């Protein structure tokens, strides 16, 4: 969730900044502002804001809650063996932790809750960020398979970076005994799942051009293979499929 939350930070900067008028973006928020104005909720560029301004939060609060026993462990160590006596006072993020029965059961059902309550959000966050494309009238976007697809792209992208971090978090500063290589083995399946689910959509794209496309959508994908970006798509699909 580190590898998520910081990605979301360097992500959210773009919607704040590929706009030309950054300073006038608080209008996008639904504050009762200095006039009787409010945003337009038919706009996936707005869904993105609430989504990411919820997804930065839920993923954080689910990570922060995820790491309570750490702060308990580190708060417990800061007194007897650690940096300073004043790391304990920094570790008040423990929030009066003792590992008790009364609230550890609650921690489980909450971790269950956010699992079954952040996944329905994850499938809406990236889907929103796909809805912005496919809601349009463009032929290369209006194809409806995209929200599952880009999600699989998020799988096939995200794990494709986690492994880059784990390899370099395994050579020098590594955990041979805890980051078992068998983990990365069973990790790349759910990558390779989307190594083919991503591939099936390219077929559908490349298919519907031949099946019942608009005479533009017929051309829209001939462009992708044959045209300026032949350097991209021939190699890209082949890269993501080979």
């Amino acid at each position: 969730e580190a590898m998520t939350i910081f990605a979301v930070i360097c992500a959210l900067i773009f919607p704040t900044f590929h706009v030309g008028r950054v300073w006038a973006i608080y209008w996008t928020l639904p504050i009762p502002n200095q006039m009787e104005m409010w945003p337009q909720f038919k706009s996936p560029l707005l869904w993105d804001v609430f989504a990411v301004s919820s997804y930065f939060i839920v993923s954080l609060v689910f990570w922060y809650v995820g790491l309570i026993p750490d702060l308990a462990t580190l708060r417990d160590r800061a007194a007897l063996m650690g940096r300073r006596l004043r790391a304990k006072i920094l570790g008040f993020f423990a929030l009066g932790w003792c590992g008790a029965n009364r609230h550890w059961r609650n921690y489980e059902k909450v971790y269950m809750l956010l699992a079954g309550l952040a996944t329905p959000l994850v499938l809406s966050v990236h889907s929103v960020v796909s809805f912005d494309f496919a809601v349009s009238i463009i032929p290369g976007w209006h194809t409806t398979i995209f929200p599952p697809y880009f999600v699989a792209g998020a799988i096939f992208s995200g794990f494709a970076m986690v492994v880059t971090l784990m390899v370099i978090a395994r050579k020098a500063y590594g955990l041979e005994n805890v980051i078992t290589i068998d983990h990365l083995e069973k990790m790349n399946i759910i990558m390779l799942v989307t190594g083919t689910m991503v591939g099936f959509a390219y077929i559908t794209e490349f298919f519907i051009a031949w099946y019942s496309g608009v005479p533009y959508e017929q051309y829209a994908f001939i462009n992708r293979a044959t045209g300026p970006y032949a350097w991209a798509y021939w190699t890209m699909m082949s890269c993501n499929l080979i």
Binding site: G20, Q40, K42, P215
Partner: protein
């Protein structure tokens, strides 16, 4: 925090005008030896936009491209701030004492002028009041691009000087013969346009239509909106017209046109024209020797059409032979005979081929005096350079082309101290103090008013009405009996044709520091900011050059054409229309300009070079290469002997279109009168409605019960009364390209630089995209189509849905209005729209805008800041002042109380714009017409501007194929 920006009202209130509201003064507009009419807005005595003169029947309220940029020539920076002597900006008050003492006690004094061509009586009469004193005034009218050549061919044909008018509504079939009658370069662009368009305007399942037959040597805009066009090198069009008339019956004429006995497009049209006597026309362009225009007189008289080629006797002005005077001028320069040299509005150092020297004489003679608007190459070389007024401060008089006798209203005081308009300067030479042009001009009229009412009821009436009504020359009859038939053997060949031709957006370079015009796509090719050479792929593939693009920017090779040891190079671009061994190098675009303002550097952290288009200098510098001096002044449009050298420095060349030739797509859907006679429901047949479902417009969505038009909050205002829409009679739409420029001035914009538009952004809202359609590339017959494309302000409107920051809405009356405030710049307003018309204020072009052009942006609309979209808005600004004026006093909006810029400027009455749901207006007649062409209707968008298709009209067989 904000400033306290004050307000400085009148002191000595002029009674008529009022602060907030403009009022329309009625000026003229000189160029090219004639004077189009015009009508300004004049916001509080400051001109902001020009318009047409609806009373003047020659124009009937229209303005081509070439005027609206002149409005910005008025407000240029780097015009003529100081008076320059020797090149030094020294002073004025000494010049009057100087030039006055030169003038009164002068005697013979042997002066010369080299004027802009007069077309005005105050100029031509003051010439006599001038020539009365000083003995010999050589008085050469240096026509831009030499003699007009329509007129010199006819002084012998009719035995005396004459000009034609060319109605074209009383006349159907038109062999052009290179004639750009529909060309903004040429004169009388309206009366050529309109009554030609009316012939093209059907409003019926079938009507009798022009069916021209153009035979151009260089692909030009008239050849586009056309039928059966042909490519054939100039310098041989005489040989074309030679075998032409022999197949009609005037004379033998066989030897000149040796090889066109039985050509299809010749023998085809010949039977038709003799079969259309009171309807056929024979024009003639400008790329010829004058015997062609004799043939334009011989056959057109012999054809029987005289009321269709309305002909009008000039005021005895046949003497415009460029050889006869301009050489004969410098033949006196080299002898020390002529002393003074009084240029008015011209750059002959820029122009004026070296084959007949000018600069070699200019440096010989002192007492040089250049009256001038810019400071280009003539001020820099002269000893005195007056500054010049534009025509907006002249009190000038002027003739419309061949007809009425108009007069300027001067609107603004001289913006610059001591401008000293040419007319009173020409009278300052007349041995008195600077004549008040207001009182000078008036003194001519009493000798020539031709109106029984005195001045303060007539002067006030003409200065009001814009045109002296009864004038317009008397109409001559047939003079020719086959006189002019003896300059044929100038059909010379044996070399690459190097023909010149003036783009619609510039005229002999005299309007180059003009962004609205300079960043104006040519209609042939959406080219901007560079002169070019256009030619065939067969010569290119036989020469070795290309218009290759691996970045969508058209990298270009070069030519390095060489004439008589006076070679220069330039970008070569290619077009599938032009013929073998010929290139149309456009002029202007090579006009060095000398700046008074700084280059305005800012830190490297800040962008100025990409934005400050007026920064690095003034505009006309280095935009291309100068080309005028190369030609030979004999038949001074054409040229031979270009020893081409494909050399390096292969640099960019930028366009808006960037491409062409739709792949058989539904975006123009041309159709024949044969096919149109068969299926009037063919604008829909390309993408018809569905199996058993409704017609396409007014097609229901998923929602119909909660649709906002059925809800009040969209329906409840003072607006729903009059839904607005804007059709386009595309049958008369050809790349005049003035549909743009009035949008640019009415609803303000900035310009864009080459360095910027190369990446593909242009802040022209109304794309005027052209397209090619060949028979699956059969013979590479282009058969172009032009069609404007504003933001068809949709109903379903994907863009409206998608601005999260509600900066878009289907405003009442089909209007889909943008707000340049609420937006933020996420640009997905644009990405939805099939028509990428939601432009975007990428950089802050207006912040770097100088203290000069700022007069021009009209004081009624929201100029826009970085990070903001923008689009057509149907010129909403003049909906508001009208609908507001109807909210004050209870009324509807008339059929013509409001006219948009695309409407009021397009001289072909293509756009009509009258409110939908008002059945008496023109739009409901033009929408209820059979071909309500609904562009990309198939996306269930339901838009307004349900415009029309073209109906190209081919010929029955007649040995056409």
């Amino acid at each position: 925090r904000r400033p306290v920006e004050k307000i400085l009202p009148y002191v000595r209130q002029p009674e008529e005008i009022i602060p907030g509201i403009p009022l329309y003064y009625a000026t003229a507009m000189p160029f090219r030896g004639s004077v189009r009419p015009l009508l300004v807005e004049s916001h509080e005595g400051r001109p902001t936009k020009i318009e047409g003169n609806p009373d003047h029947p020659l124009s009937r309220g229209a303005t081509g491209v070439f005027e609206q940029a002149s409005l910005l020539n008025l407000y240029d920076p780097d015009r003529s701030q100081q008076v320059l002597r020797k090149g030094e900006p020294a002073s004025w008050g000494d010049f009057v004492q100087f030039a006055r003492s030169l003038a009164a006690e002068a005697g013979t004094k042997r002066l010369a002028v080299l004027c802009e061509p007069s077309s005005s009586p105050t100029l031509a009469a003051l010439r006599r009041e001038l020539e009365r004193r000083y003995a010999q005034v050589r008085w050469v009218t240096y026509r831009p691009e030499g003699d007009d050549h329509e007129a010199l061919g006819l002084q012998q044909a009719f035995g005396r000087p004459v000009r034609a008018r060319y109605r074209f509504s009383e006349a159907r079939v038109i062999v052009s013969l290179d004639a750009d009658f529909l060309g903004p370069t040429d004169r009388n662009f309206v009366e050529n346009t309109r009554e030609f368009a009316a012939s093209r305007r059907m409003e019926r399942p079938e009507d009798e239509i022009s069916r021209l037959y153009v035979i151009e040597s260089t692909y030009t805009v008239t050849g586009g909106m056309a039928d059966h066009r042909l490519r054939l090198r100039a310098g041989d069009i005489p040989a074309f017209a030679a075998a032409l008339a022999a197949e009609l019956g005037v004379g033998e004429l066989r030897e000149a046109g040796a090889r066109f006995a039985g050509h299809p497009y010749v023998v085809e049209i010949a039977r038709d024209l003799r079969a259309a006597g009171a309807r056929g026309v024979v024009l003639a362009g400008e790329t010829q020797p004058p015997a062609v225009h004799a043939l334009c007189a011989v056959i057109n008289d012999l054809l029987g059409s005289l009321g269709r080629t309305v002909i009008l006797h000039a005021l005895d002005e046949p003497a415009t032979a460029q050889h006869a005077a301009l050489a004969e001028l410098v033949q006196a320069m080299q002898a020390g005979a002529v002393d003074a040299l009084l240029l008015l509005n011209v750059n002959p150092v820029y122009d004026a081929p070296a084959a007949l020297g000018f600069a070699e004489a200019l440096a010989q003679v002192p007492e040089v005096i250049h009256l001038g608007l810019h400071v280009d190459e003539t001020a820099r070389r002269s000893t005195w350079h007056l500054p010049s007024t534009h025509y907006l401060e002249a009190w000038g008089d002027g003739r419309a082309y061949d007809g009425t006798l108009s007069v300027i209203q001067p609107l603004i005081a001289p913006l610059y101290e001591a401008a000293h308009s040419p007319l009173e300067v020409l009278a300052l030479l007349a041995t008195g103090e600077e004549q008040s042009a207001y009182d000078l001009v008036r003194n001519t009229w009493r000798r020539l008013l031709a109106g029984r009412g005195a001045f303060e009821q007539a002067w006030q009436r003409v200065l009001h009405d814009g045109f002296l009504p009864d004038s317009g020359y008397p109409t001559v009859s047939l003079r020719p009996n086959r006189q002019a038939l003896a300059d044929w053997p100038q059909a010379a060949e044996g070399g690459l044709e190097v023909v010149f031709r003036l783009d619609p957006t510039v005229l002999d370079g005299s309007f180059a520091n003009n962004a609205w015009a300079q960043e104006l796509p040519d209609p042939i090719t959406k080219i901007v900011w560079d002169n070019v050479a256009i030619l065939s792929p067969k010569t290119a593939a036989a020469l070795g050059v290309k218009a290759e693009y691996h970045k969508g920017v058209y990298i270009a090779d070069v030519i390095e054409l060489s004439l008589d040891g006076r070679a220069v190079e330039l970008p070569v671009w290619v077009l599938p229309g032009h013929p073998d061994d010929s290139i149309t190098v456009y002029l202007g675009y090579g006009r060095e300009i000398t700046s008074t303002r700084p280059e305005r550097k800012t830190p490297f952290f800040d962008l100025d070079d990409y934005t400050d288009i007026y920064g690095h200098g003034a505009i006309a510098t280095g935009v291309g290469v100068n080309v005028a001096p190369l030609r030979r002044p004999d038949n001074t449009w054409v040229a031979y002997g270009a020893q081409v050298r494909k050399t390096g420095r292969t640099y960019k060349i930028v366009t808006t279109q960037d491409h062409g030739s739709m792949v058989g797509r539904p975006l123009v859907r041309l159709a024949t009168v044969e096919e149109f006679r068969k299926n009037p429901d063919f604008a829909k047949e390309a993408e018809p409605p569905l199996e058993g479902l409704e017609p396409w417009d007014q097609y229901p969505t998923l929602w119909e019960e909660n649709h906002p038009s059925k809800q009040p909050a969209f329906q409840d205002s003072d607006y729903y009364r009059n839904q607005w829409a804007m059709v386009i009679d595309l049958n008369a739409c050809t790349g005049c390209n003035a549909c743009i420029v009035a949008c640019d001035s009415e609803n303000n914009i900035p310009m864009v630089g080459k360095n910027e538009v190369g990446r593909g952004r242009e802040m022209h809202w109304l794309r005027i995209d052209r397209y090619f359609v060949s028979d699956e590339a059969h013979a590479d017959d282009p058969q172009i189509v032009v069609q404007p494309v504003p933001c068809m302000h949709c109903e379903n409107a994907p863009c409206e849905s998608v601005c999260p920051v509600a900066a878009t809405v289907h405003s009442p009356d089909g209007l889909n209005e943008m707000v340049y405030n609420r937006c933020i710049g996420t640009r997905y307003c644009s990405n939805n729209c099939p028509y990428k018309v939601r432009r975007f204020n990428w950089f802050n072009w207006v912040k770097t805008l100088p203290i000069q052009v700022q007069m021009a942006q009209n004081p009624d609309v929201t100029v826009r800041f970085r990070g903001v979209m923008e689009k057509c808005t149907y010129c909403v600004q003049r909906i508001r002042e009208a609908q507001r004026q109807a909210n004050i006093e209870k009324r509807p909006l008339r059929d013509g109380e409001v006219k948009t810029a695309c409407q009021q400027a397009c001289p072909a009455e293509a756009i009509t714009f009258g409110d939908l749901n008002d059945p008496n207006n023109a739009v409901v007649k033009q929408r209820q017409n059979a071909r309500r062409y609904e562009m990309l209707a198939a996306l269930n968008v339901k838009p307004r501007t349900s415009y029309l298709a073209r109906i190209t009209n081919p010929n029955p067989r007649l040995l056409e194929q």
